[PDB]
């Protein structure tokens, strides 16, 4: 299973915090497997559906 | 410790006293920074 | 995911991160932040700037952000975490060794949990337990209570 | 006050139903005791801010 | 030029060489490298005398290569290029 490095998460500023636009206390749950997130979504598939 | 020997031998043989082609205290720190997933490239 | 499944693609842990960085644009987000700092200044401009830091720092570099996520973890030359026994029959071994072994164990654990096939939640627990090992193998004392 | 409240929440930290219910609770009855209670000073913003109502600086 | 016999090391003089070069550091290197060349010429007796011109001036009893080099440099028998 993939894993990250702490400096890029506990960077304060967390370097993933900005490259992804997501603030910590939310990725806190993501990488430590305490919640789920979504890659993308289909606008055209959903429009006609 | 690998240079003083080369030096003793050079002198006793009468050949040009050598020179470290690339600094030598650097290698353990190079390893352990590479081991930490930080690419390092001695340039030239 | 049961109903409405194939319309969105959810993931957990760094895996999701991986995905959202694979199918990811840089110069697009970069110009987004640029037009923000030049059009939507306000007070939250500080965030636009502090964030484009890493983006325009990840532009002409031969290192995609993938380097954060680890699919291939190195180990240190044994001698640098030395182990030697004194005269008499007693060892003297580094302290880092422990953490390494833990990673090893957890890896194999998960690497056979795949064959166990337990629902995704035991899998999440074991993945958490294996990345808790790297959380401190690089810098122990960084999240909550250390090892 | 905060220490007393932490030892209180230690109840749900270890009194989940009967006690703990993890494979550690036969020798170390407190793995999650002092991994939840010694981590809740870090997972605190909610706890600390909603404490600031009852004992404000 | 109105001085007396420069004694030992002080011969060849210094202000004479410092005009045969850009500076004093460049003279350090401009002498050390030729010292290496002289030594590698002396040590190599089997290999033919090629790529090693030897000493351009007459040596002495032993006249260690550095002195031969600085003398040659006094006689304007060398060229050099910086980096």
Curated annotation (Swiss-Prot), chain A:
Gene name as annotated: rpoC
Shown part of the complete sequence: 99 to 147 of 1317
Known role: DNA-dependent RNA polymerase catalyzes the transcription of DNA into RNA using the four ribonucleoside triphosphates as substrates.
Protein's name in the database: DNA-directed RNA polymerase subunit beta'
Highest taxon of source: Bacteria
Subunit architecture: The RNAP catalytic core consists of 2 alpha, 1 beta, 1 beta' and 1 omega subunit. When a sigma factor is associated with the core the holoenzyme is formed, which can initiate transcription.
Signal peptide segment: none
Origin species: Mycolicibacterium smegmatis (strain ATCC 700084 / mc(2)155)
Family: Belongs to the RNA polymerase beta' chain family.
Curated annotation (Swiss-Prot), chain B:
Coiled coil: none
Top-level lineage group: Bacteria
Subunit field text: The RNAP catalytic core consists of 2 alpha, 1 beta, 1 beta' and 1 omega subunit. When a sigma factor is associated with the core the holoenzyme is formed, which can initiate transcription. Interacts with RbpA, which partially restores Rif-inhibited transcription.
Note in the entry: Mutations in the RRDR sequence (residues 423-449) confer rifampicin (Rif) resistance. Rif blocks transcription initiation but not elongation.
Function according to Swiss-Prot or TrEMBL: DNA-dependent RNA polymerase catalyzes the transcription of DNA into RNA using the four ribonucleoside triphosphates as substrates. This subunit often mutates to generate rifampicin (Rif) resistance. Interaction with RbpA partially restores Rif-inhibited transcription; once the subunit is Rif-resistant however RbpA no longer stimulates transcription.
Stated family: Belongs to the RNA polymerase beta chain family.
Protein known as: DNA-directed RNA polymerase subunit beta
Lineage of the species this protein comes from: Bacteria, Bacillati, Actinomycetota, Actinomycetes, Mycobacteriales
Included stretch of the parent chain: 1087 to 1130 of 1169
Swiss-Prot record, chain E:
Source organism superkingdom: Bacteria
Membrane-spanning ranges: none
Listed GO CC annotations: DNA-directed RNA polymerase complex
Catalytic activity: RNA(n) + a ribonucleoside 5'-triphosphate = RNA(n+1) + diphosphate
Gene Ontology biological process terms from the UniProt entry: DNA-templated transcription
EC code(s) of this entry: 2.7.7.6
Keywords: DNA-directed RNA polymerase, Nucleotidyltransferase, Transcription, Transferase
Gene Ontology molecular function terms on file: DNA binding; DNA-directed RNA polymerase activity
Self-association and partners: The RNAP catalytic core consists of 2 alpha, 1 beta, 1 beta' and 1 omega subunit. When a sigma factor is associated with the core the holoenzyme is formed, which can initiate transcription.
Function: Promotes RNA polymerase assembly. Latches the N- and C-terminal regions of the beta' subunit thereby facilitating its interaction with the beta and alpha subunits.
Family of the protein in this entry: Belongs to the RNA polymerase subunit omega family.
Name of this protein: DNA-directed RNA polymerase subunit omega
Residues represented out of the complete protein: 24 to 106 of 107
């Amino acid at each position: 299973a993939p894993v990250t490095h702490i400096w890029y998460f506990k960077g304060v500023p967390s370097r993933l915090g900005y490259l992804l636009d997501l603030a910590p206390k939310d990725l806190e749950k993501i990488i430590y497997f305490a919640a789920y997130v979504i890659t993308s979504v289909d606008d055209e598939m959903r429009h006609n559906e | 410790t690998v240079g003083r020997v080369k030096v003793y031998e050079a002198i006793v043989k009468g050949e040009n006293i050598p020179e470290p082609g690339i600094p030598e205290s650097f290698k353990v720190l190079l390893k352990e920074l590479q081991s930490l997933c930080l690419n390092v490239e001695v340039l030239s | 995911q049961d109903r409405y499944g194939e319309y969105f693609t959810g993931a957990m842990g760094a895996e999701s991160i991986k995905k959202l960085i694979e199918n990811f644009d840089i110069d697009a987000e970069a110009e987004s932040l640029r037009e923000v700092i030049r059009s939507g200044k306000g007070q939250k401009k500080l965030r636009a700037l502090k964030r484009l830091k890493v983006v325009a720092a990840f532009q002409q570099s031969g290192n995609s952000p993938m380097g954060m996520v680890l699919d291939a973890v190195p180990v240190i030359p044994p001698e640098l975490r030395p182990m030697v026994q004194l005269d008499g029959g007693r060892f003297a071994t580094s302290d880092l060794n422990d953490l390494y072994r833990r990673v090893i164990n957890r890896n194999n654990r998960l690497k056979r949990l795949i064959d166990l096939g337990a629902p995704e939640i035991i899998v999440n627990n074991e993945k958490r337990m294996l990345q808790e090992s790297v959380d401190a193998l690089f810098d122990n004392g960084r999240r909550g209570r250390p090892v | 006050f905060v220490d007393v409240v932490t030892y209180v929440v230690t109840e749900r930290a270890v009194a989940r139903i009967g006690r703990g219910w993890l494979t550690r609770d036969d020798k170390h009855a407190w793995e999650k005791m002092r991994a939840d209670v010694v981590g809740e000073l870090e997972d605190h913003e909610q706890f600390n801010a909603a404490l600031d109502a009852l004992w404000p600086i | 030029s109105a001085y007396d016999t420069p004694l030992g090391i002080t011969n060849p003089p210094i202000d004479e060489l410092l005009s045969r070069a850009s500076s004093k550091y460049a003279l350090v290197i401009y002498a050390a490298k030729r010292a290496r060349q002289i030594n590698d010429y002396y040590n190599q007796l089997g290999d033919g005398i090629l790529e090693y011109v030897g000493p351009l001036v007459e040596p002495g009893l032993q006249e260690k290569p550095l002195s031969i080099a600085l003398r040659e440099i006094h006689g304007d028998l060398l060229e050099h290029t910086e980096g």
